[PDB]
Design a protein around this nucleic acid. Structure first.
Lengths: 76, 57
RNA sequence: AAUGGGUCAGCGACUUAUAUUCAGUGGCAAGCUUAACCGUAUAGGGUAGGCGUAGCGAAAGCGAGUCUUAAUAGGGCGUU
RNA sequence: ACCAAACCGAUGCAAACUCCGAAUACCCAGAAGUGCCGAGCAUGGGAGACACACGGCGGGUGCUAACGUCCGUCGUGAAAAGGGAAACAACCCAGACCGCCAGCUAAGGUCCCAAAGUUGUGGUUAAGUGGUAAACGAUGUGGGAAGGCUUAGACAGCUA
RNA sequence: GGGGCUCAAACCACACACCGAAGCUGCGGGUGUCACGUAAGUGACGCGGUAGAGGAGCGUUCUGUAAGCCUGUGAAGGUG
RNA sequence: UCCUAAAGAGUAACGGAGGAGUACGAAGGUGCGCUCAGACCGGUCGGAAAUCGGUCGCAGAGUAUAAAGGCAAAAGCGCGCUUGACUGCGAGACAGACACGUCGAGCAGGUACGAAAGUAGGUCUUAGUGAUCCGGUGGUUCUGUAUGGAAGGGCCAUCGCUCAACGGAUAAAAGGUACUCCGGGGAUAACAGGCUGAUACCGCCCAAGAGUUCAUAUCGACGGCGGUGUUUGGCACCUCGAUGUCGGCUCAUCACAUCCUGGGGCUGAAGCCGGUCCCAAGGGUAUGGCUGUUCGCCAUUUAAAGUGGUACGCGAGCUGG
RNA sequence: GCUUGACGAUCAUAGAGCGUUGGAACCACCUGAUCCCUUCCCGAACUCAGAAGUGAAACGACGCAUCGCCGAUGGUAGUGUGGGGUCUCCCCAUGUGAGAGUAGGUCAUCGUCAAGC
């Protein structure tokens, strides 16, 4: 019966978009529950943060059954 | 091969993107004529600011 | 149709001291500079001190190296 | 005779619905040219600001009221004069270093006040419409497609 | 906006002219920056502006230069 | 946590919706085991539905908790071990004014587990929180005011109480002022002006209807569309280095949406009177009893006692209830 | 060379639904629990001594296109920029451009490896 009190807006989203060079520790997707999945060299942190585990460029394939949007990094 | 554009309107209330298309094309004030190479990456600045210019060819 | 001034002439508001930082400009230079004070006194003496030449650590300490942990194994700070 | 959730088809609509899904914007890499001689970045010295306004657009709020108010994004005024909008921070054009009794234009204009066409061709409009306005109402007039009755003699007008 | 306008001085099209800004061009004017110039020297791009930053100056009174120089053949001051 | 929020982040409102101030020694790791809900149906105690036995199933279930987003390589239960809800760290990022915050291996201390590749630095994810200063506690190799010690201090680990005005003024915090004072403001209210017109007021459009028949002589439900700025608002644009109230008095001036007088149309207008609608602003348009009144209610008039604007006209004209 | 295995490329043009089959190899059962153990009670789970039996069920490829699923072209809605209007909305220039709908493919297309014919 009283409105107010929005939260503080967590800055989620795809950082470091899908052609960019990476180093092997970079947060690659901030994410609220694996809207994107883990490809070849990426890591899947505890809060479903995708992180590059090797160097290269990030690809963003769609692959497999279930229609998974993948994030894979290819050492190119 | 070579196109020549003239600036016929101002840059005053124009968008910051469009006047950067006119400065980057070589133009400085009204009725100034430059001779521009006809590469398509040069012609795209002529097209983003088509309304400010006159393109004699 | 918001403030102030009737007008003239005088007056009337970023200063000074002491610490400090940065810039410019100089003297000396791995050193530089003195404070009180002394002085037939803006000279000259007086180098107590201050800063510089080495850092790291809370510290003992060790030093071109500590901390930590049973661990000289893994990073931060410094270094011609 | 009352009715009856669900199911089949037809049919709508959501800011907190989405099987879908752009333009743009944003991120990245590589390239020519331009940059006023730099634009970008980094460290230092000095700030000022931390009450903005209105206009276009995209929305909340309000009454899709307010020169209301709260955001986004532009442009302007703030801090910008000159020409136009009669006069008119914020709209349109344009950004004033100084001089000229030189010439071309922009927005806007060209009968007189008032600088320039009483300009040409073709139409429309009789209300001073222009030069303020809604539901709705009328043989006001211009244009255009079509239809039914149409000299075996229609619509309003004569002697069974 | 007013006078006033009715085959328009209104509206709709199209054509051609013209006027109109501190815009643009012509012509004459500093250095603002920068590149060149063994530094005479021209070029090129600029030059609205509040808060504010930067850079350069003028004038007043005093001290040194000054026991100089000017001044009663006329100073400062005042008025042209 | 969603919306607003404009398909990258971000993004305001006393805008619209909900939540949190925790749980968990298993609800974690791992080993191992294992996959929903729905309708369909079988009546001697439940008969919509249980026990669940098995047929079409077509995530619609479940997740400790709000909502969003996620899932089966399960991201729910059973059970063993009984601990990785590890210690030292940490390349590199994300967020970011700062303080904070978020994500993340390999060697060892060393590990549960698996017989092993390997997974494990808590939980499907994002809330479940609190700086510093003072104290408390357990370590310590550090310091230990002549020296040896202690005291006190430092470092490391952890607790408190209470900062929910939740970046926390102090260990410790309620009012009155019509007796008031000062400094400011039209960054901001009251009067008046201005913008707007919900609201009020006045017109108009369709006409169910009543009007004894007959929508339109009068009246009109349901809805519609406008005008006037006429007041209740709304706004905070002017005015706070002052624009001094309501009413009466005195004087007015304009409007026409006309109260009287003048000219007309229609009538459910016989006449006398009226009703209603046009046209018309020339001149007229009370006096008193009550009340501070405007109004109002009353008494008696009049041809008629109109409605509005003018800073709700008028206080450098008056009064001052 | 085909049958069929064995993990995988690609993910409802590959999916579900309606016939014929294969016995030798493979595959599910089957005979039973003695020796491992599986049981919130069980050998249908699953562990297996197995190979007495069996090819329908079980699954497997192999049939058949109603349905799902893809889906043009053209238009339309939206929209960047520039300019208009009678401006709570649309139009013009220009760039771009869906969603839904509109004949119909299909019982998919691939790759390595092996026992057998």
């Amino acid at each position: 019966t009283r409105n107010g009190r929005d939260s503080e807006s967590k800055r989620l989203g795809v950082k470091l978009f899908g052609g960019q060079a990476v180093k092997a520790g970079n947060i690659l997707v901030r994410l609220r529950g694996t809207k994107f999945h883990a490809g070849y060299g990426v890591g899947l942190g505890k809060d479903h943060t995708l992180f590059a585990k090797v160097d290269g460029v990030v690809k963003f394939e769609t692959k497999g059954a279930f229609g998974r949007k993948y994030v894979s990094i290819v050492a190119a | 091969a070579t196109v020549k554009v003239t600036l016929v309107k101002s840059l005053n209330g124009r968008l910051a993107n469009h006047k950067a298309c006119v400065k980057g094309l070589g133009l400085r004030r009204i009725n100034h004529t430059v001779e521009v190479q006809d590469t398509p990456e040069n012609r795209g600045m002529i097209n983003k600011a088509y309304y400010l210019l006159r393109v004699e060819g």
